[PDB]
Structures are given as C-alpha cells and as structure tokens.
Amino acid sequence: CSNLSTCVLGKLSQELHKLQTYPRTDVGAGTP
Ligand SMILES: *[C@@H]1O[C@H](CO)[C@@H](O[C@@H]2O[C@H](CO)[C@@H](O[C@@H]3O[C@H](CO[C@H]4O[C@H](CO[C@H]5O[C@H](CO)[C@@H](O)[C@H](O)[C@@H]5O)[C@@H](O)[C@H](O[C@H]5O[C@H](CO)[C@@H](O)[C@H](O)[C@@H]5O)[C@@H]4O)[C@@H](O)[C@H](O[C@H]4O[C@H](CO)[C@@H](O)[C@H](O)[C@@H]4O[C@H]4O[C@H](CO)[C@@H](O)[C@H](O)[C@@H]4O)[C@@H]3O)[C@H](O)[C@H]2NC(C)=O)[C@H](O)[C@H]1NC(C)=O
C-alpha cells in the first residue's frame, strides 16, 4: 500500500467488520 490512508482505513474497516460479525473466527487485524 502506497496509500497508508485509503488502504489503512480499509484494513481498519475490514477488521471491525470481522470482529463484529463473529466474536473470533480468524479476525484480520493487519493494522500495524
Ligand atoms: C490512494 O491510492 C489511490 C490509487 O489509485 C489514489 O487514487 C489515484 O490518485 C491519483 C492522485 O490524486 C489520481 O490522479 C489524478 O490524475 C489526474 C491526471 O489528469 C487527468 O485529468 C486532467 C483534467 O484536466 C486537467 O488538465 C487539463 C490539461 O492540462 C487542464 O486544461 C484542466 O484545467 C485540468 O488541469 C486531464 O487533462 C488529463 O488528461 C486527459 O485530458 C487531456 C486534455 O484534454 C488530454 O490531452 C489527455 O489525453 C487526457 O484525455 C487526465 O485525464 C489529475 O487531474 C487528478 O487531479 C489533480 O489534477 C486536477 C486538475 O489540475 C486538480 O484539480 C486536482 O486537485 C489534482 O491536482 C494535484 O495533482 C496533480 C497531478 O499530480 C498536480 O499537478 C497538482 O499540482 C496537484 O498536486 C489526479 O491527480 C488517480 O486518478 C487516482 N486513481 C487511480 C485509479 O489512480 C488515491 O488518491 C489515494 N488516496 C490517498 C488518500 O492517498
């Protein structure tokens, strides 16, 4: 990711989707 802006918000949004939908079933959280 050249962005680290559009991309980082995308990854944070994806992380939030996963942990909300399911408690814990391989949450992404690739957000250093
Ligand atoms: C996360 O990552 C993603 C990755 O995708 C990022 O998305 C991408 O982001 C970039 C950068 O913003 C985008 O680039 C864009 O590039 C165009 C290039 O020009 C196009 O539009 C022209 C419009 O007309 C202008 O030019 C004519 C001719 O000189 C003038 O008469 C007009 O008045 C305008 O100035 C067009 O002319 C170009 O060519 C076409 O038309 C001509 C003329 O008819 C033909 O000859 C050609 O053949 C052809 O048909 C071309 O289509 C920029 O225009 C975009 O916006 C910049 O320029 C605008 C106009 O000046 C200005 O209003 C904007 O503010 C902006 O200006 C900034 O950037 C300029 C370019 O570097 C600088 O010169 C300027 O100083 C200023 O810094 C835009 O830059 C990508 O499209 C976009 N998507 C993809 C898929 O790549 C995303 O942004 C990232 N997000 C974050 C948060 O990090």
Swiss-Prot record:
Localization annotation: Secreted
MF terms in GO: hormone activity
Keyword list, A-Z: Amidation, Disulfide bond, Hormone, Secreted
GO cellular component entries: extracellular region
Family annotation (InterPro entries): Calcitonin (IPR021118), Calcitonin/adrenomedullin (IPR021116), Calcitonin_CS (IPR018360), Calcitonin_peptide-like (IPR001693)
Domain of life: Eukaryota
Primary location group: secreted
Keyword Transport recorded: no
Disulfide feature: 1-7
Proline amide found at: 32
Family: Belongs to the calcitonin family.
Record's function text: Causes a rapid but short-lived drop in the level of calcium and phosphate in blood by promoting the incorporation of those ions in the bones.
Protein name: Calcitonin
Protein's organism: Anguilla japonica (Japanese eel)
Source organism phylogeny: Eukaryota, Metazoa, Chordata, Craniata, Vertebrata
